[PDB]
Amino acid sequence: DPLVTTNFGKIRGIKKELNNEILGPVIQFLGVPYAAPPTGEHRFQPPEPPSPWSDIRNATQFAPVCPQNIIDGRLPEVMLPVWFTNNLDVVSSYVQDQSEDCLYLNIYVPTIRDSGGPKPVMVYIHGGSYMEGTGNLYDGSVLASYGNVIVITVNYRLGVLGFLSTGDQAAKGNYGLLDLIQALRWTSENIGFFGGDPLRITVFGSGAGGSCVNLLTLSHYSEKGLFQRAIAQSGTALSSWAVSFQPAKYARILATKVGCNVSDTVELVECLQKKPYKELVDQDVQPARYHIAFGPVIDGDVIPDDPQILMEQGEFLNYDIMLGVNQGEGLKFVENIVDSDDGVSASDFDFAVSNFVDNLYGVLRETIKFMYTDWADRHNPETRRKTLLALFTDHQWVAPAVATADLHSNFGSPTYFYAFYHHCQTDQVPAWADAAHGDEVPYVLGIPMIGPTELFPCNFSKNDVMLSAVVMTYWTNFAKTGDPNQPVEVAWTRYSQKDQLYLHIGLKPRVKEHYRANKVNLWLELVPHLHNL
Amino acid sequence: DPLVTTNFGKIRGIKKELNNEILGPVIQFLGVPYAAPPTGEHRFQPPEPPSPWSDIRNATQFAPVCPQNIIDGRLPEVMLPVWFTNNLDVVSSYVQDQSEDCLYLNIYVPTIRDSGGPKPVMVYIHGGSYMEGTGNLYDGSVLASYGNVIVITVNYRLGVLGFLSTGDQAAKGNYGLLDLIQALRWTSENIGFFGGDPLRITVFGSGAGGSCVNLLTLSHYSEKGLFQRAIAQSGTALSSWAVSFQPAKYARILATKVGCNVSDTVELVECLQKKPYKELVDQDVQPARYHIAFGPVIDGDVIPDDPQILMEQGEFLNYDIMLGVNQGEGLKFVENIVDSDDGVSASDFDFAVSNFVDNLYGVLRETIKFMYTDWADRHNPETRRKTLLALFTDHQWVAPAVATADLHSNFGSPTYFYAFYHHCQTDQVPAWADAAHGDEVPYVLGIPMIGPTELFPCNFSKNDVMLSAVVMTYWTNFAKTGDPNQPVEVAWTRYSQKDQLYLHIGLKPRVKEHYRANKVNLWLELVPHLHNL
Amino acid sequence: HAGTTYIFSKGGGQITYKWPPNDRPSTRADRLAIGFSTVQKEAVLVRVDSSSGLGDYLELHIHQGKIGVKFNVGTDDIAIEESNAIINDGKYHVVRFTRSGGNATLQVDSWPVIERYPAGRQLTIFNSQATIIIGGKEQGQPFQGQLSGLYYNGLKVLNMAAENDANIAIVGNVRLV
Amino acid sequence: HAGTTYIFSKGGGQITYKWPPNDRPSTRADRLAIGFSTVQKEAVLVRVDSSSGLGDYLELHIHQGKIGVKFNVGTDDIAIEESNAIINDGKYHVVRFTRSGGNATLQVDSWPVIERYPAGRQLTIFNSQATIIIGGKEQGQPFQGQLSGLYYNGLKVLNMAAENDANIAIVGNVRLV
């Protein structure tokens, strides 16, 4: 029987076996409460510490997830990972059990003739678009086991409940962000009791998640010592959809939709502070394409200034940073109009850009089109597609990523950058597609080592399981020492602005320099200079 | 004794031996007059047919060259070939003997157990900037011999004498162009008497010369049948310095300098029609950088419209076309400011462009700079130079070249395109330099096969002589059949707009496609679209 | 009828000369002449076309009983026609066409020579000529009668056809005489 | 003097702690305290510098006999000083520094606590701190006297030096007591 005493009470976790004969067992503590339920008067309020119990709390099954609605395709296809979209079914059978009281986290502890002493802790911040998800999807047992580290998937307030701001004092948003910090405080204090080492906490996440990871490092609320490392996979604080800059506009539109658009903010907040949680979560506030309606907001306190500025001013502490992108992040962007012959009509391309420009920049247009046309084949529709997809991929993921890595290094932080070129080949993702947004998640969670799962159906090859191990060993080594190479043919050299060495993670890992240097520069360099006249 | 009867009289040519034991002998007929001396009242007048003689005319030594002045470095360094500039000495000892009566051409005939029947004829139109030169420099004996073709280097009115126009009727310029046609008429009628085949005349030239070649194919004065093929090496009718668009402006400035800027054109022409030929040729009319003062002009008759338009409207007859460029054409452009460490200061680069833009286009600036900076090494001064040189090379040579090839093909003309990547390594041209403007000439004239010469000093390696043969065999085969592959590992496939196959002529000849497709497009595609708003 | 004569019966026919790729000529001037005999009101006798893409073309037809020509080398369509004399009287007639850029010339039998000197600015070259089509069938106006001594810029296409030229292809209700 | 004491003689000296590369910390807040004794009018006691490039720095000096501090984390230079009390009287004195972004704090012996709250918008982080230099020699104002119990954000640099720390490097006329 698995018992552990915490500063709030004792709890019992259920032990589990893994679908592999090399992976030891794992003790799972599902449903642990790390804060006071954000209910009633506590809604739209900074999270509170949790209340203690005397007895022994049954922590053996996922606690309810936060209020969301994914079914009716109102979810921004492009922003969410592919595995999440190409399987809304299985996903639904996770977030089907909701509740306004959802602030809970899951702990995965390994069990031992290899390493003695406190084990590192990897906190995974899940994320889609801030509107849905649950760290309950990501089962970090193979990771926890295979790496010999404790893994914690966290749950935090999403949607309206988590990030609604009025622009003024009525509601300063960033609630879900504060929730994430509260989880980290809880961790830094109690993970010790589970054999964890509060001096080696690495927070990591994918997409919207990695955006939190990054925003967390920009908020003064994360004080020195809270967590030591960060891994931001396919995600930044610099993307167009990482922050909401019109928190009021969309707050009032949500107000109007549930009858509350009063002229005074404070009344408007109280108005909403009443409505059934499910009434607010089912509205339909639509944000400009490639932008978010509800999410982190520049409040001046939690998020002191615009991420992009803070980054340039070095307004962040020093952590060990690891971040990267996947080859074809923006699959969904083009997958939308790829004819039966796997091509793209030059008129659809000319259009897609003109449109992309209208939304992200309201002449550059002709410059973009030029830059993204392989003239040594200016007519191949299959090529015309590859480049059209790179356009999104470069701009929405690669450019911001490099931007981040460049500054994080120029300011002392030890940085490692990676490019992911390998995905699992199923029938749900076209053959001509490549590593799409999120295709790295199943390799970071060691799924291949336990064969296909209801969530990740793909029929993993021997390579997938092999590469899965190569990845996990990096991630964990990193979590262990702050170097993907210690302790456990290719040395993942460090990323510096002068050489920009990145590890090309694929079936042939190998260090290359200046990832997509050209386009990366078009976006961080030329485009600005132009829109500057 | 070498004698030949022509429709104007008999003439004696001196026979010659070649510095190689594989090259047969050659009968040279130097100084042949192909037209009436452009003197007195004939100055600024279409050339006239030559007057006949009864006896036997001694055609054994170069006749005087046309009026020019190269010594005092007033010559546009960049426009002239490198071998010409890096050796003004030897060059001077050619054009030292001047005369207003210079319309003469040289014939090089081979002497025979290989081919029976009339031999093909290759007429070489020399050219620098239209202000100097002489086909007397180019000795086509090794070519004539090694290929089994007759070679004719021609002389035509240069400078003021050859292209001065008043913008109106007073003087319609293009005199040197008409001279070149008169040479072709003479050839088409009498080259038969030398064993030549008037049905296989190929006119070729380098730089300013190849510009004439091209302009010749655009003038209606070159009627069907005159000549059948054309080779334009590093030169077009499309370059900024191929035509003079302000013939009046520079005519009056020449007038003012010799006291003649009267208000009436006709008087101004007569005024100049008097001055000693050497007084006009020694003035100093300066044209805008990258442009010409005196040269071919759009007169509406000889040159019907703007070359660039004629080209797009297919206003040219069909010929077998062969044209190309060299790797580092614009050496002189950057050689100007390459510090001791073979680099280029980013400020000198930022400058060179801003300047280049001011002259060729009076914002694109920032776009050019971007396009010509290897961001995967945005600081290497040696690289910063390579690209800065490509800028000129691409714009002044490569772009116009491709432009021509694309249209010539789209209109039926069988076209072949080549890129020259190999030069002779001497001490006059830096080591970091590559095939500069004109470095192909010595290989097309078979110089390597006769060892270093006073003109071409370089110490030719066994490769140079080898590659020299490879080149000559193409050029001649072309002149022979209109296919560089017939009759004599690499097949020089044909150039079509859809695949743009070009022969990468170097030590490893091999066919590649879409030469510098990227930049070529920036210049013929993007830059225009922009300067279009 | 002068020399080689071809007879086009009902159902029309078509003799087509296809210039070998690397030999499709371009021309600033054109000399076209042919001798015919027909009792039609509408019909196209000869038509030269520039390889697909380039627009240029030359057409010799009979519109409302009068022989005429329509061509285009790049600007607009220029036409010239002998509207006075009549030629669909089943008897022998010879027409001669001449082009020099836009400016053109026509002449039937012995009537005065007609001169057309097109408007504003005119283009000059008939680019990459690829096919000569006799029979005016493809153009949708079949010819029925007899054609002899067809001369186009040096090509005596009709003999060429008779002498089984590797490039001439006869198809339809055409017969030699 | 509290515990480990170091004596700086004429010719000055310098104890320098060099943080191991991948460990140069960044901080929003700072706690610096040290006990000294000197009879100088001008002299720099302690100075922390951010790895070459980044500007940030912290300096504890004595200007005209009064102990004070000057630092910069990104905006302007912010200084705070105990100008009332005097401390270059050769006797024992203890100063405590505090930073929280721009806002800072100073306190000598027992005098009232001084508070500096900089102007407009202020930056917060002292990026990549790479070296702690005691002796104020390199900055061109050698110190001569005695320093004890130096505490900087948890580092008791002086003991570290005494216990021959792999990173502390002593050079000059400095001696242990």
Ligand SMILES: *[C@@H]1O[C@H](CO)[C@@H](O[C@@H]2O[C@H](CO)[C@@H](O)[C@H](O)[C@H]2NC(C)=O)[C@H](O)[C@H]1NC(C)=O
């Ligand atoms: C010094 O402490 C902080 C900076 O670290 C200052 O922070 C806020 O500054 C605003 C603007 O003047 C004040 O109105 C707030 O009251 C401060 N609140 C916080 C978060 O501390 C602070 O002002 C400074 N000290 C004070 C409160 O006087």
Ligand SMILES: *[C@@H]1O[C@H](CO)[C@@H](O)[C@H](O)[C@H]1NC(C)=O
């Ligand atoms: C939950 O608590 C109950 C209290 O009666 C305990 O009996 C049980 O073992 C715990 N969990 C389960 C269902 O095993």
Ligand SMILES: *[C@@H]1O[C@H](CO)[C@@H](O)[C@H](O)[C@H]1NC(C)=O
């Ligand atoms: C909501 O109410 C405010 C104040 O009454 C008003 O300014 C705003 O436009 C309203 N929202 C809309 C446009 O429905």
Ligand SMILES: *[C@@H]1O[C@H](CO)[C@@H](O)[C@H](O)[C@H]1NC(C)=O
């Ligand atoms: C194996 O993968 C394929 C999908 O491409 C499919 O057969 C199925 O999903 C998996 N299992 C099997 C063999 O049925």
Ligand SMILES: *[C@@H]1O[C@H](CO)[C@@H](O)[C@H](O)[C@H]1NC(C)=O
């Ligand atoms: C030139 O012609 C003369 C005729 O008087 C002849 O004697 C001589 O040999 C010829 N060649 C020369 C110039 O030697």
Ligand SMILES: *[C@@H]1O[C@H](CO)[C@@H](O)[C@H](O)[C@H]1NC(C)=O
């Ligand atoms: C030449 O004379 C004309 C007539 O007045 C004058 O306008 C022109 O400027 C003169 N040329 C120059 C620029 O010397």
Ligand SMILES: *[C@@H]1O[C@H](CO)[C@@H](O)[C@H](O)[C@H]1NC(C)=O
């Ligand atoms: C051979 O060329 C080089 C100059 O590049 C130099 O050795 C000399 O000028 C030439 N001949 C020799 C070996 O002297």
Ligand SMILES: [Ca+2]
């Ligand atoms: Ca470390």
Ligand SMILES: [Ca+2]
């Ligand atoms: Ca700073």
